[PDB]
Amino acid sequence: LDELKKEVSMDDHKLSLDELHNKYGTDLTRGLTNARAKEILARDGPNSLTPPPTTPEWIKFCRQLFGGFSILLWIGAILCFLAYGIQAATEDEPANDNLYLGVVLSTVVIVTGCFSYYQEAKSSRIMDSFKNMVPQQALVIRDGEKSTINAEFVVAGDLVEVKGGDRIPADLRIISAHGCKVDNSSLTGESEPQTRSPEFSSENPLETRNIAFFSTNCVEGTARGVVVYTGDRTVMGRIATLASGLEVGRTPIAIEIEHFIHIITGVAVFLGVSFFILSLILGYSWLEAVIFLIGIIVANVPEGLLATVTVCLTLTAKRMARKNCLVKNLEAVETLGSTSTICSDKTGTLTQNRMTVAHMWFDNQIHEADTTENQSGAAFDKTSATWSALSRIAALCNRAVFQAGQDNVPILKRSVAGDASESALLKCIELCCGSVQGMRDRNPKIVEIPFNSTNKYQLSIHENEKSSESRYLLVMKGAPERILDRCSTILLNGAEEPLKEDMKEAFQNAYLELGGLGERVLGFCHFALPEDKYNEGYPFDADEPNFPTTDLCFVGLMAMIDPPRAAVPDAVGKCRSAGIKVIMVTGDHPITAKAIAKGVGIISEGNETIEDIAARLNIPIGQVNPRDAKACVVHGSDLKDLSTEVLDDILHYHTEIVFARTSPQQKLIIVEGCQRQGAIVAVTGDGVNDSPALKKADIGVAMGISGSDVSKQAADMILLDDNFASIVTGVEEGRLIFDNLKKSIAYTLTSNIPEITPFLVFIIGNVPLPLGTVTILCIDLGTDMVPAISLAYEQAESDIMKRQPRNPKTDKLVNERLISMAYGQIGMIQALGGFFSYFVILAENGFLPMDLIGKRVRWDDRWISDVEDSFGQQWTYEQRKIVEFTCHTSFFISIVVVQWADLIICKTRRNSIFQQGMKNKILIFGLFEETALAAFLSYCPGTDVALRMYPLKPSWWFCAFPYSLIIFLYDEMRRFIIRRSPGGWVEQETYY
Amino acid sequence: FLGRTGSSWFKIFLFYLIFYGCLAGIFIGTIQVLLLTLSDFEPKYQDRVAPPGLSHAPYAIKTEISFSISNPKSYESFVKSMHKLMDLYNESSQAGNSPFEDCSDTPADYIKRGDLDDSQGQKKACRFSRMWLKNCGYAEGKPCVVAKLNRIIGFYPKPLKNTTDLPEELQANYNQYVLPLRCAAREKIGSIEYFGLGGYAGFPLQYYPYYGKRLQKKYLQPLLAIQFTNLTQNMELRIECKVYGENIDYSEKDRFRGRFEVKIEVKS
Amino acid sequence: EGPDNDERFTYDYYRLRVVGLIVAAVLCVIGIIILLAGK
Ligand SMILES: *[C@@H]1O[C@H](CO)[C@@H](O[C@@H]2O[C@H](CO)[C@@H](O)[C@H](O)[C@H]2NC(C)=O)[C@H](O)[C@H]1NC(C)=O
Ligand SMILES: CC(C)CCC[C@@H](C)[C@H]1CC[C@H]2[C@@H]3CC=C4C[C@@H](O)CC[C@]4(C)[C@H]3CC[C@]12C
Ligand SMILES: *[C@@H]1O[C@H](CO)[C@@H](O)[C@H](O)[C@H]1NC(C)=O
Ligand SMILES: [K+]
Ligand SMILES: [K+]
Ligand SMILES: [K+]
Ligand SMILES: [Mg+2]
């Protein structure tokens, strides 16, 4: 469906103005007829974007109500009402058991539904942001007259007019223009104004001057044009549809959840029906056969687990909110940890998005300035008298000014009225020479010649601030070579000197080096005009050369670039140390893209492209073995004629990849290419041209300050302070939460065994029921909750940023090793500790373990109010039941006591508690509150009716203590083996 | 295979065999020590049987014994359980001076055979003739229910003293030696008739305290036969038999805590 | 005692409940203290 939109567009900028009118039945001068425009409206439809059909929240909520655990809990809830119905008909049961348990279980499903619904959130308003880029109104020429109309009423063929400050209402063929410049950052991510004129200037319509696009704005001048595309058919309207239309897809974390749901659901249905038939064979009435099944359901399903996961995710997202990293989708909290490839935009993401002075060439020396936002570098020069001469030209031969009321904000961050290069120079001098306004007050400008297309230079004449002179100084800047052809002397370390071929060659060298760094280079020179030839009232003519512009003194060079953000180089290296592959994907030109790649460490030192090898060896590129080149730089124009299989080979064959001059669909294609190889991919960006890629990414991260509204709609995560170091933190947090989820899951599952085994022995042994159904829910929904959550606050056991990204195909959240430990080893020890306390309670009340076998028949018989114990005493029905429920209560408390040790062992997968310590305060809180809850549930009056919880005698609490301790020792010995031999036996069997 | 290789499948079996073996051996060990802390003659706790329960022979479907006099197999179900109990009170079961003793044919005081020790043989229990149960196949019309006080080791059932008012106000009040049992329904549409030891409507105190199964096997607890020769027919009659005493109490939950709940209906 | 051994069939479930609830409360307070050591 969207495969059409993933392709490069076709256009009609090649046609003549006249020819273009024939195609759209239009007038170049009079414009369309009121009738013809209305006709075309009904024909083509409105100049608007329609949002894609969404899934209502209704269906979204209910889709969770049927996912493995909820299905089993539904079967339980209904099976409760089943047994209740069968009762209400047969023998009038005045009880509330099956009825209430059926109500409780149905509530558990609904509430669990809210948790998973909260986790599976999708806040997407892509198409809405795009719609915000179409103006409310447009100016059209109809019947030879200009009028403002609803922009939706704009059709292909009419004559539109735009001017500085307004949004392009539709894709236009420029037919007339006067000084028109446009901001195409929507399509390129670059905000430098692009001229628009009627002349065709490139085969590529996205590069030609005679096309203006919807989603962009006119920055200055005026233009008229013929509408060629409207609504969904515009270049960026299609990007809108592509972006808004892209199928979301399941996250890595989501896939893991479903996976263990299958496992646990599997064992649940297995043991469920495996013992349902095992009971009927033993001659159990279907009346009972279902009651046992309900218990089996409740025992096997970890009722509180899915909600635990959600809370652990939420708590991890809260910590990241506190580092200026907003998470829109709870699952995106983990994806960053599983990320193996980052596709990053350059401008406004890796870079500050601001022309900044990078180097200066004066005194036959290359000086480097500090490009960082917060200025974390050092000085270059202050002493040289040459510097002050260059500094003066940079301030004086400059027409840029700071906007009013910025004195509060830092120099480099403040808004400037002017072109990017003049702003850069302004901020450079203001920083290291103080107020520039002061320099422009001490040296009043009397005449100037602003930068001309033809002159290729800008000159200014000022009253020298010096009192002993107060004469006229000439300054000029422009193209380095043009400035050179106008110089005779060079200000070396203070004093001038003739411009010999020697210094002239050093100039060329300096010029070539700076240009090689992808930096824009300017020349600077001045000339102190002779006093006798220029009186204090001498008039200077700016129109006609009234003053010399030759034999001037060359002062120096200055170079500039849109520099990396301070934290970016280090963040890139850190991603790469964690084994994450970092690719650059930018709408910017290749020379600039490549230079920043080396600056931030995308391309490491020494690595070459095929073009680099060819130039170094002075040989044809076809003569170069492409396998000798680990780095590559792909232009979008070449990308366009490559198949995906060939794109896949590029991705496979290079470690250091730069995709430059890419369109928005091309970014999507590169992302998909990476994913196709089985990689989890993150995208980082800030422009509307990142929207499709951000949507398709497993996780999209947008910049918060510099980011466009669209990009932040398309993302899963926002960096609110533009701190790229947050990606590094995000991946670290993502890995940590993945491990801690394992700990929390194992902990929760472990207590399933002591809830399952009592029901089994109840059938096979014919003893009184050791633990009840209600009692199970008091564990999974009550006591285990805070402890399970607390594992989310566990510190790393080792340097997680030192390991490679997990293999999502092999490294699962819940594997066989977890089940073996939780179900086969620790849970089994917990089961016994439960049974022990059960036998203790009964034996101390007169029913010794031996006489318990095959007694349930008489025990449950409501009409036998005289059962004989081991000592020959006789018990009524309600009397023995009180002891039985007291058994449920102590078995319950036994679970809590054995979960103490389990909580401590689940703390660490490898390390010892004596190494990791007990610095998790939430965990300790869990221990205290868990025990408080259990005690309250046993001793609070009335709980014997609502939950069948009975007061325990002090000695009862200590039954499971020896089992709780064996768990601690056992797991500590086991992990001691793991560490002592990384070989594999204990490791490959039990290492979560 | 599914998971691993044969070598791995073996090792995982050798482990869980030794592992579960140890766990079973430990579990058994903790059961040993538990038993080691307990007496053979007396349970550690008795507060959960404390107030004695009162149970009868007619096995009630739901605290009810409804049947038809004009039908044979209508009551043959209740006669099965009635027989089961009384079959134990046979004279052939109580033979010789061992381990039985002839006790007062009239309600007497308690009898202490020492302590809950094995320092003596089987503590000798009082004989009880089912022949003390006058009038009661059993009552084919108007049932002859048999009551019973639940056995509790070392329990001395203490009758109420005639200090103040009483339900069966002072009638045949053998204050010193009889634990009374008065059945009731207002709703007085019946005819209560009690049979027991010495002809009294109670339990003779000479059968106490019970020394337990280990120290007193073949022991016999006193019975109290109750006959309802009601002149009514074809209606559910809620009859409650209540025992009175200092150590006797009741509960709204446990409807068998020192009392009966019988729903007789001679639907004939 | 002899016939006056009523205490054998008695248990102070009332005190046990009072003590049990005291303990539960204090464990609840202790937990808050440790948690609130930083929020
Ligand atoms: C306990 O006493 C009952 C009294 O009914 C015995 O029942 C006797 O059963 C035999 C054989 O079935 C009959 O011939 C008699 O008529 C019954 N009564 C009597 C008085 O002998 C019963 O057998 C006795 N049980 C034991 C174990 O001795
Ligand atoms: C109540 C009692 C009788 C039930 C005992 C169940 C035992 C036999 C179960 C419980 C957990 C189970 C193990 C759980 C995990 C694994 C790892 C997997 O890669 C192979 C199977 C294996 C090794 C299972 C084998 C059987 C097992 C040990
Ligand atoms: C009980 O049986 C005796 C004979 O043993 C008889 O005289 C008497 O009438 C019976 N009593 C009743 C109330 O039927
Ligand atoms: K469970
Ligand atoms: K995404
Ligand atoms: K559980
Ligand atoms: Mg950008």
Numbering used by the authors:
A (entry chain A): 32 to 1023
B (entry chain B): 25 to 160, 169 to 217, 223 to 305
C (entry chain G): 4 to 42
From the study:
Na+,K+-ATPase is the main active transport system responsible for maintaining electrochemical gradients of Na+ and K+ across the plasma membrane in all animal cells. Such gradients are essential for cells in, for instance, generating action potentials and regulating cell volume.
We then proceed to visualize the substitution process utilizing Tl+ or Rb+ in the medium by X-ray crystallography, as both Tl+ and Rb+ have larger atomic numbers than K+ and measurable anomalous scattering cross-sections. To visualize the substitution process, crystals of Na+,K+-ATPase in E2·MgF42−·2K+ were soaked in a buffer containing 100 mM thallium acetate or rubidium acetate and flash-frozen at various incubation times between 0.75 and 100 min. Diffraction data were collected at wavelengths corresponding to their respective absorption peaks so that both difference and anomalous electron density maps could be obtained. The time constants were determined based on 14 (Tl+) or 5 (Rb+) data sets selected according to resolution (<3.4 Å) and unit cell parameters. Presented in Fig. 3c are series of difference Fourier and anomalous maps around the transmembrane binding sites at different soaking times in the Tl+-containing buffer. However, at shorter incubation times, substitution of site II K+ is much more prominent than that at site I. Essentially, the same maps were obtained for substitution with Rb+. The electron density maps at various incubation times clearly show that the substitution does occur in the ATPase in the crystal lattice and is significantly faster for site II K+. We tried several ways to quantitate the occupancy of Tl+ (or Rb+) in each site, and found that anomalous occupancy as determined with CNS15 gave the most consistent results. The plots of anomalous occupancy against soaking time thus obtained are well fitted with single exponentials. They yield time constants of 41 s for substitution of site II K+ with Tl+ and 105 s for site I K+. Using X-ray crystallography, we have been able to visualize the sequential substitution of two K+ bound to Na+,K+-ATPase in the E2·Pi state, and thereby shown that the K+ at site II is the first to be substituted.
